[PDB]
Design a binder for this molecule. Structure first.
Ligand code: AMP
Ligand code: AMP
Ligand code: AMP
Ligand code: AMP
Ligand code: F6P
Ligand code: F6P
Ligand code: F6P
Ligand code: F6P
Ligand code: MN
Ligand code: MN
Ligand code: MN
Ligand code: MN
Ligand code: MN
Ligand code: MN
Ligand code: MN
Ligand code: MN
Ligand code: MN
Ligand code: MN
Ligand code: MN
Ligand code: MN
Lengths: 326, 326, 326, 326
């Protein structure tokens, strides 16, 4: 009954804004439908495989990585809503040409879940949007803001259905892509996560690298001291799918620092911050183990951060173990 | 270039068959496209939620469970290829009315991955097909054959794209649904699994219930005795998605017996056997820990079995630990 | 490469407008995709047949008439771009509720070609858009402006492909709906009609009712005095399809006054004016036989007018015959 | 509820056939969906325009002509149901390679309505199917049978929706393509044309070339001697669209001989015969003016014939005028 565009317009209708945000999200939706279309038949389009280079954080580049990067960059330029673009796929920020320049900075991972592409598991797109603040010429530094400054963030999940989850100041809403008329339609309004869940999600292949707090925490999930039933384990291996399930079912998702990676793996600007902002707008928590993800001031557009997120009593329980081992 | 129908006809073209198998798979494809269509927009169709009963193995029944069960049963009847139908959703086998009766028995899970429906993770449909052997009137007993007797088995995966994986006597092929013309198109021919992989997939929330062989096996994945890199962990929580990844990337998927479930959870007829047959046709192995899944003679259409499957050196390694603890 | 939204924004980008027009056309596109979707499978949705009433001009109301009317009205309200709506399906103008009120008046035929629905011939949607001028409370009178005041007009054609043809002050462009990603994509830029064509389009079943100018004109098409080849006849029987072909191939389309209908059949506000404006922006002409369609000041939202349109040398030839018989 | 495949199988189920016909129509449906898909977005695929040659009857070849010809030929080969193929696009019959040879001869117009492609009016595909009779090696002569020998004929109409109309010995049924699941679904069962209609359909641009019977007949449609209301005129200019409307609304469609074309324009094998067979199975009539289309023994695969078809009292009325002028 309500499309994403309708919803957002009937909203900024309040914020009394200039409709730029609305253009920005309209454009992104177009990118997102196009990626979704290609993804649901990638093998028929021969879109599996590498594109033959390595990106800034050292990921081998897949064909969908390239295709989805070009779609997002292009639609964002043509929106007239943006001035600085940070993409996981590009070493440096992309400044938008003056004539198409708009007020927003957008950090995004055009296709998240690379390792899961060829086995047809859920993958997604992640974005976070900042208002340019400085009056300087637009530059890479306009992307170096803490997540606490986000005006909007969320992700497209190409899962069993394609969902656009969009968090802004007042709350989180889910919009499902109807493939027939190619519109995103509101299906979940003002989403809130459960206070406590019963699923934990981490790659246990890193057991030998985990610090003692994560180690103790996982052990308590398997052998609860109060004799409750042990938590269920889930780890899809695509951040967007695992975080989405954490949102709608509750529980906790972890990609902590470990002995080989003092700052974890996941990227602060375009993986960790958008998901922490979604989680916080749903009443959840997102921490590194020692500080709120959203309060970290980045110094590098490609910097990494540990992230633990989801239901606040689950995350709090893990915080108390870190504090304990501090 | 090659659709599933073309492929199968150009095949039985050899087996010199009566084209019944081809009708059977044509019909199933129609069910599968219809379920795929509903699934990619389930929330817009209001198809999330329970249907308000409990099935034979004790699963709470979801709306998609019902919809997908009715589609599969209906298309299979109308195929003229079948005589006995076993569905996870129905307490008893369904005998097909004489006028539509054909020679095949079909065991199927019309929608697998229930727990993952509402969080939009991959779900699927699983099927295995037997030739009726007895000359008796068709009855439930015609479904009580070991998996070694399968003539065809496989599954539809509603993941990032919709894939139909179809194993028959000569090998395994993957066909991707092209949503545009609504045909399944051949994308992977004569699939073979790697001899050894580097991903393990099990719900570790059951740690406290695992027997000593599974326990030792998981510990070796995390701390390899030969100092290699530890295996990666993946557990999507839908059998079809986890098995599919095991197929195309190699490694091992486990749902073993445990202290509460001497026969594991997954159902022999319509979960374990179709996947073991796929795996064996790809050169992989599928065991309970003590015997080949495909050799078990069922006594109950809803009976459970432990299953460990995937790359033969991974499964063999786990067999040797069981033997050791025997 | 260029969607309708992109195109229109990169345009008003010039007119330096408030983006209201852009919202208006975005919304309309959503209506249009939805109608297109229903239309391409109307029989499967049981959408053929009457809805069981008679409209203001006396048309028996079809199911698609109702469905398409509700979609257009709804999306136009929710656009915040409109204040007065005139629809062929509603006796009176619909005033938009203050909170959703915008500056534009929109006259539209939500589904044109009724007689052709059940035989699956091309049908369409027609619209014309006026700026509210008065400062009075919005009322029916704001729709009573001559076509010369249009700021935008055009039509969606549900033909072999779905095309959105959009005329504004600077020219006419065609955008084709890509069903896959559900976006309208620019396919024909700055369309101009040929100066002279070689197809005439009129219902000759009305021969006995035609005035002497139309009669002489048709006879000259069949027996050209200069011995050229006779014009080809085409009459699809849906105004949108016949006018569209007149646009892209040139020639003339006629629905003149006749002995039973001094003002023809087609409705001035939402059939004749939008098509005359398109034609004039393409360099064509649109007349009643005695005056320019676009200069008629309506007194009735449902009033009829004769219309002759297309290539200027064809229309001019017919004007000269009227003048001759004057 | 009933797909084309289901319907046809539940039919030959009676004729007790070998399922070859069913394979043949399955294959054709796949061609037809593929052409439909391309057609609904032809401009986005750049598929408008000529392919740069002239075909046997002298038509300039369009891109869709080529694409649709290759799809039909390919799917028909791979069906194992055919041995000789006649296409409007190929000078000579195509003999199928022994290994894929089946018992049927198929004459088809892979894309009918060329002149209407670029203006997005309805176009279609026409087919007629004969059993090979001789025991000779298959050759062009196996296509030279009268239409009275057809076992099946009909057409796909790419109009406002895509319809497959299929006539066989017992009657005519319509199946609508559901774009969502890509199946043709039964929407009109055992179609019969009205005995008398009230629409005439002919290109009147040929007035100066019509014989006296056609001339008198058209004049009576415009000035009925019994004072009834004059017939409505319709002429879409694509045979498939005009014939389809004649079927579902009744009336008459004419492409007669004229002074320049003693045998009319339309091709006997793959335009006239399939449509005459459909019409006769619906209780209608199809004549040249002097003999039944279906009884003409062709001598040339590309030969032309006059055709007048539709409601039997309309066609009969025109027959009586020919007899009168004989
Ligand atoms: N459609 C909208 N929904 C919610 N907030 C909006 C919207 N548009 C603008 N805003 C907020 O108000 C400010 C001005 O918005 P705008 O100028 O319309 O991009 C932005 O920084 C947003 O934080
Ligand atoms: N299309 C096919 N592809 C592969 N094997 C087939 C096919 N059709 C039949 N068979 C095999 O040959 C036997 C006869 O097949 P049918 O009678 O055509 O169902 C069956 O039991 C199958 O095991
Ligand atoms: N996207 C656009 N393309 C072309 N003209 C526009 C556009 N937006 C506005 N205009 C024109 O400029 C005026 C202000 O437009 P707006 O206020 O944006 O609706 C309108 O009356 C239009 O005639
Ligand atoms: N599915 C069917 N529906 C109607 N008639 C059929 C069908 N299959 C076969 N026939 C008729 O019976 C004969 C044998 O059909 P078949 O051998 O199945 O192609 C053909 O020449 C057809 O005229
Ligand atoms: O294989 P790992 O080390 O568990 O990493 C998986 C993670 O990496 C990512 O693919 C991004 O690199 C995430 O989507 C996911 O959460
Ligand atoms: O939550 P658990 O106990 O790990 O069970 C998950 C398994 O159950 C199933 O949903 C079937 O019941 C499988 O698809 C999946 O492999
Ligand atoms: O049947 P007639 O009198 O030729 O009218 C056909 C005309 O009527 C309309 O359906 C609108 O009423 C137009 O789309 C078309 O041009
Ligand atoms: O332009 P004409 O001479 O009326 O011919 C139109 C006819 O030609 C065809 O395009 C086939 O050549 C038919 O589809 C249609 O009935
Ligand atoms: Mn990456
Ligand atoms: Mn990522
Ligand atoms: Mn990425
Ligand atoms: Mn279940
Ligand atoms: Mn299951
Ligand atoms: Mn199930
Ligand atoms: Mn009407
Ligand atoms: Mn109309
Ligand atoms: Mn109308
Ligand atoms: Mn031609
Ligand atoms: Mn033709
Ligand atoms: Mn043709």
């Amino acid at each position: 009954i309500v499309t994403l565009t309708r919803f957002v317009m009937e909203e900024g209708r309040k914020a009394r804004g200039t409709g730029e945000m609305t253009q920005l999200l309209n454009s992104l939706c177009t990118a997102v439908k196009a990626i979704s279309t290609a993804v649901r038949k990638a093998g028929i389009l021969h879109l599996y495989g590498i594109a033959g280079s390595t990106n800034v954080t050292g990921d081998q580049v897949k064909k969908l990585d390239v295709l989805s990067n070009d779609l997002v960059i292009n639609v964002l330029k043509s929106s007239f809503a943006t001035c600085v673009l940070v993409s996981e796929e590009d070493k440096n920020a992309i400044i938008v040409e003056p004539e198409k320049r708009g007020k927003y900075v957008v950090c995004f991972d055009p296709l998240d879940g690379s390792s899961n592409i060829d086995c047809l598991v859920s993958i997604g797109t992640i974005f976070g949007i900042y208002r340019k603040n400085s009056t300087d010429e637009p530059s890479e530094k306009d992307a170096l803001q803490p997540g606490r400054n986000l005006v909007a963030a969320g992700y497209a999940l190409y899962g069993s259905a394609t969902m656009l989850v969009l968090a802004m100041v007042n709350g989180v809403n889910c919009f499902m892509l109807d493939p027939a008329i190619g519109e995103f339609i509101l299906v979940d309004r003002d989403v809130k996560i459960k206070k406590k869940g019963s699923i934990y999600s981490i790659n246990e292949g890193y057991a030998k690298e985990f610090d003692p707090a994560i180690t103790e925490y996982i052990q308590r999930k398997k052998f609860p001291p109060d004799n409750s039933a042990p938590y269920g384990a889930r780890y899809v291996g695509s951040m967007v799918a695992d975080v989405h399930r954490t949102l709608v079912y509750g529980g906790i998702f972890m990609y902590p620092a470990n002995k080989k990676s003092p700052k974890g793996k996941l990227r602060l600007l375009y993986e960790c911050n958008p998901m922490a902002y979604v989680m916080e707008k749903a009443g959840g928590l997102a921490t590194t183990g020692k500080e709120a993800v959203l309060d970290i001031v980045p110094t590098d557009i490609h910097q990494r951060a540990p992230i633990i997120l989801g239901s606040p009593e689950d995350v709090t329980e893990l915080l108390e173990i870190y504090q304990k081992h501090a």
